[PDB]
Amino acid sequence: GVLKIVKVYLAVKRRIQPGDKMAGRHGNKGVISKINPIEDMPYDENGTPV
Amino acid sequence: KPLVGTGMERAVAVDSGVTAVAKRGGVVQYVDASRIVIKVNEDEMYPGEAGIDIYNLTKYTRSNQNTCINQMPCVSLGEPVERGDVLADGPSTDLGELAL
Amino acid sequence: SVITVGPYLRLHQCGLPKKMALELFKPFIYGKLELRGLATTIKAAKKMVE
Amino acid sequence: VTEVEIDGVLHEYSTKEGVQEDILEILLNLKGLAVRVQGKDEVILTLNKSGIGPVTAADITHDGDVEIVKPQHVICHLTDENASISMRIKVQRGRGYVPASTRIHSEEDERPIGRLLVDACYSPVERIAYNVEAARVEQRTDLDKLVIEMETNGTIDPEEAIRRAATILAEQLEAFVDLR
Amino acid sequence: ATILAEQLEAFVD
Amino acid sequence: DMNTDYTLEEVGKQFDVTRERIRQIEAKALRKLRHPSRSEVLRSFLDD
Amino acid sequence: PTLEWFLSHCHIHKYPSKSTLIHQGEKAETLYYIVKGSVAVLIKDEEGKEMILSYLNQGDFIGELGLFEEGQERSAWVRAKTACEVAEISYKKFRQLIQVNPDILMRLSAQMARRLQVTSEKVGNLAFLDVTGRIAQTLLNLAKQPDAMTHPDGMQIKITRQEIGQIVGCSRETVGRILKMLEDQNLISAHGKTIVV
Amino acid sequence: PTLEWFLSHCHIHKYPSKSTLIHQGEKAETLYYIVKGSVAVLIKDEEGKEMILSYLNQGDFIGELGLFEEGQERSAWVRAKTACEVAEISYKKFRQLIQVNPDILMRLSAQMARRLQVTSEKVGNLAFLDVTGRIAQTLLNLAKQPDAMTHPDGMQIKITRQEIGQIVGCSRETVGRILKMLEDQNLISAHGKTIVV
Amino acid sequence: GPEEITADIPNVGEAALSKLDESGIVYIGAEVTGGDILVGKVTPKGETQLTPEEKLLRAIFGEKASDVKDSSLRVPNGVSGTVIDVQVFTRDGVEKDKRA
Amino acid sequence: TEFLKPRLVDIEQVSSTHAKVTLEPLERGFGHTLGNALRRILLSSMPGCA
Numbered sequence A: 001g002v003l004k005i006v007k008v009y010l011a012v013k014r015r016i017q018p019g020d021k022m023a024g025r026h027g028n029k030g031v032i033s034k035i036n037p038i039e040d041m042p043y044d045e046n047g048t049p050v
Numbered sequence B: 001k002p003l004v005g006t007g008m009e010r011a012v013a014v015d016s017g018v019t020a021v022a023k024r025g026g027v028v029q030y031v032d033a034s035r036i037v038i039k040v041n042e043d044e045m046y047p048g049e050a051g052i053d054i055y056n057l058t059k060y061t062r063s064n065q066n067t068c069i070n071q072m073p074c075v076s077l078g079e080p081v082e083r084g085d086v087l088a089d090g091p092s093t094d095l096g097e098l099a100l
Numbered sequence C: 001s002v003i004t005v006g007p008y009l010r011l012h013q014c015g016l017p018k019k020m021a022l023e024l025f026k027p028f029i030y031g032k033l034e035l036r037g038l039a040t041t042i043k044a045a046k047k048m049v050e
Numbered sequence D: 001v002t003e004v005e006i007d008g009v010l011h012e013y014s015t016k017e018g019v020q021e022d023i024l025e026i027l028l029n030l031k032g033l034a035v036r037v038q039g040k041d042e043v044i045l046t047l048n049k050s051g052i053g054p055v056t057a058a059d060i061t062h063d064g065d066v067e068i069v070k071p072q073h074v075i076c077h078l079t080d081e082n083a084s085i086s087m088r089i090k091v092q093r094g095r096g097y098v099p100a101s102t103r104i105h106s107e108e109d110e111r112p113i114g115r116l117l118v119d120a121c122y123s124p125v126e127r128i129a130y131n132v133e134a135a136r137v138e139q140r141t142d143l144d145k146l147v148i149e150m151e152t153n154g155t156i157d158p159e160e161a162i163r164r165a166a167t168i169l170a171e172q173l174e175a176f177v178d179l180r
Numbered sequence E: 001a002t003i004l005a006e007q008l009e010a011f012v013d
Numbered sequence F: 001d002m003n004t005d006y007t008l009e010e011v012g013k014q015f016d017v018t019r020e021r022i023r024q025i026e027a028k029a030l031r032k033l034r035h036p037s038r039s040e041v042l043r044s045f046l047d048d
Numbered sequence G, H: 001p002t003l004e005w006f007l008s009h010c011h012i013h014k015y016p017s018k019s020t021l022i023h024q025g026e027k028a029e030t031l032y033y034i035v036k037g038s039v040a041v042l043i044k045d046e047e048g049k050e051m052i053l054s055y056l057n058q059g060d061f062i063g064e065l066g067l068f069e070e071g072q073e074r075s076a077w078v079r080a081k082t083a084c085e086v087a088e089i090s091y092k093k094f095r096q097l098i099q100v101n102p103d104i105l106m107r108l109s110a111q112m113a114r115r116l117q118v119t120s121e122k123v124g125n126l127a128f129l130d131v132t133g134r135i136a137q138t139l140l141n142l143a144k145q146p147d148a149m150t151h152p153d154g155m156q157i158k159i160t161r162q163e164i165g166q167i168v169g170c171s172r173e174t175v176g177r178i179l180k181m182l183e184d185q186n187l188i189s190a191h192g193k194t195i196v197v
Numbered sequence I: 001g002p003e004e005i006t007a008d009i010p011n012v013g014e015a016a017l018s019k020l021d022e023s024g025i026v027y028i029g030a031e032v033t034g035g036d037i038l039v040g041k042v043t044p045k046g047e048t049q050l051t052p053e054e055k056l057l058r059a060i061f062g063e064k065a066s067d068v069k070d071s072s073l074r075v076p077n078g079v080s081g082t083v084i085d086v087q088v089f090t091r092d093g094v095e096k097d098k099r100a
Numbered sequence J: 001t002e003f004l005k006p007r008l009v010d011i012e013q014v015s016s017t018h019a020k021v022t023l024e025p026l027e028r029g030f031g032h033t034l035g036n037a038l039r040r041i042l043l044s045s046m047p048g049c050a
């Protein structure tokens, strides 16, 4: 009953947002609730912020 | 990469089979954004065979879990190569060492 | 949806990604657009939604 | 830069003969670029090149009314000699990081294929700090002096920016004095 | 705010 | 408005005779209604 | 040949008869090209009769009118008399390709010259000829229209006293009587068929 | 502009009023252009009765349909009603100029579109209107063409009856009659000039 | 009968058609989003009837129709991305439609 | 340059001394700039008799 077939692929990209989950190497989970403009970031004597 | 290690990570990055290795030390003939060609050393070369390899690479492709796939060289051309070495790193690999 | 914090918030308040309420409050809006008559009826209402 | 386009390609995920890099890696070799346009808020520059070896800013088609900040912001490497390249690069003027994703989101004006959208970080500045030392008057030693350290791209004069700081601060201060 | 404007009389220039 | 669908001949046998001037009425009714003053409550059902 | 090149860019939408393809006053966004068939132009008395500006056959374009200018709406209703295939491309695409290609504007402007020329011819036949003269002009000029069944003494076409009217402009009975009159001049013959003897 | 580069190698003449440039039937051999002035393009039937089909002003070409095909008779009389500066271009070099520069044809075809639109309106309102409506469309559009003064609330025009007789191509006596019949309606106030409220 | 694919679809905005080939199929390099069309497929349809109200609708606009149904591919709701690669498979026995 | 400004929206005045200020709109990254420098100068520069 099948006569010929088509298939396709697109591409999609994804970038970061609150609610996206995060962690490292100790069970150290976490989720983002905010992303910070660099100005109100605390920072050092040398201005090299966090 | 990360910065603190344990040491095994090199020995991990290889036997996934995830990328090419130096089957036979030589020199790079040709390079592409998709592939490469080498000249095999004479001593490693056998008489009937010409002794050159091609390696055509893995570009953007999917898993069961359906994420990107790709491979690319960590190297240059017209340069010597020792056997067993790598040719190309992967989506999470770097100089024969994992980078996730 | 995934969840997170509002530190600023008060009691009665709650974060809401808006598409959620958007599609969830549709016939309110369709009665409301027929009422305004920008969308005189509901096909155009959904068009204008798009 | 806000966009680029080139011969021989459709989409970023495609490839090319005689090249090390992907498309996007080279785009990323470009995001770290500096320009000092003089009169204009927007231009397109162009480039054409061939022959094995690196491709830097030295190779590009410079128009005289803009100052390039580096010759050697490295871009790519020609692996094969017969390869050739030919692209055009649209730069704008602005500030910040509404990086032309905002445009396509705002603009579904039906564009042709080829037009590689690119993310914009117009912001020139790189690092900054200040220090409150003591502005010496022989009596008023409670006076303070401010030493501000800065790091940016090219594209920028310091005292230009300083007087512009004065400008906009005072513009808003109008609303604090004038509008009550 | 006026006095601040008076701080800045040097640097509109 | 009905469970029916009355049609041509019976009307003559019910109303009086006429058949063709009905058609003519029909077209002229399309005239007076179609002109884009009443045709717009349909014009998005044109899109149906 | 150039036609197939044009059609290489097109979407062929097919339309059975009665398919009221265009409505006048629709905005103009799309060029049409008859791939197959023929179609009727129409203009409506603002309350009453509509009239056929002409008939059009294979090889030609529709909706060309609105192209040169913005905010151009459709001029006339356009109904599928017969089932037809029409090729679909848009504007600027088309402007681009005119940058690429000549000869469409040549042919189509010469055909517009014919258009305005014969429109002058019909304005003249409207003004000068009495109605029998009008119908007789039609009887001539449609025997030579390529729709004419070869008849060894005349030319035969299956008009039923209907489009002779729409083309001339008249009630149908008096066409009966002036055919009944050209029945008497050994010019014409009929059975609902028609032959120009 | 481009205009002067075209003209600089054109055989400029000054033709005064009423001079018959073109007698149709002449075999088309040279393209012209109104550098300055005003001209009437018009035709006759063999009994002599003649119709103006247009007038052309500075900015306009004529001899433009003969250019493409080689050696066909000219299409209509073209007589300068004013002292007109005319460029003159033999077709054989004008085709060389098209090979040297296109974009000379979009504009002619646009205005042929305009011409066939309005001529379709002519033929329609011919079919439709008792002269009343014909005078209606006339005084409307002449109150729209760019020679109409304003009477403070009303389009002033003074393009007097001798001329409109030829525009509509009809008896002016009925024009005066219906104009009086519209002054009954008060939409018009006319004495030499007509003021359209 | 046999289903088929080609650009020809009824009741279309050329907006969607703008990117599809003569075989009714997307060209590469594009970007797309939910509700766009990918391939115009259609299926041999039968015939039905309708209420007197829609009859009143079709009777004045002159709304005319054919005997075939649309079964065309579209982007899912909520999704968008770049058009980069595809394929087709066809029987040994079936005519390989041109672009195959 | 495509700057924004605020307009003094209101002075909700409880008392002669006890008083509010509404104030908007601003580009982001300034309300704290403002409030910082505002309260600094107000706390650290003012004449009076005592």
Ligand SMILES: Nc1ncnc2c1ncn2[C@@H]1O[C@@H]2COP(=O)(O)O[C@H]2[C@H]1O
Pocket: G022, G041, G053, G054, G055, G061, G062, G063, G064, G065, G066, G073, G074, G075, G076, G077, G078, G115, G119, H120
């Ligand atoms: N007098 C006429 N003779 C022949 N064809 C015409 C005439 N008037 C209009 N048309 C055609 O009818 C079409 C109706 O609207 P368009 O804008 O699609 O373009 C028009 C022309 O192609």
Ligand SMILES: Nc1ncnc2c1ncn2[C@@H]1O[C@@H]2COP(=O)(O)O[C@H]2[C@H]1O
Pocket: G113, G116, G119, G120, H041, H053, H054, H062, H063, H064, H065, H066, H075, H076, H115, H119
């Ligand atoms: N009905 C008409 N209305 C307006 N102008 C016309 C009409 N018929 C012919 N013309 C003009 O008369 C010209 C005669 O020669 P052309 O065919 O070169 O171009 C013609 C048009 O400019």
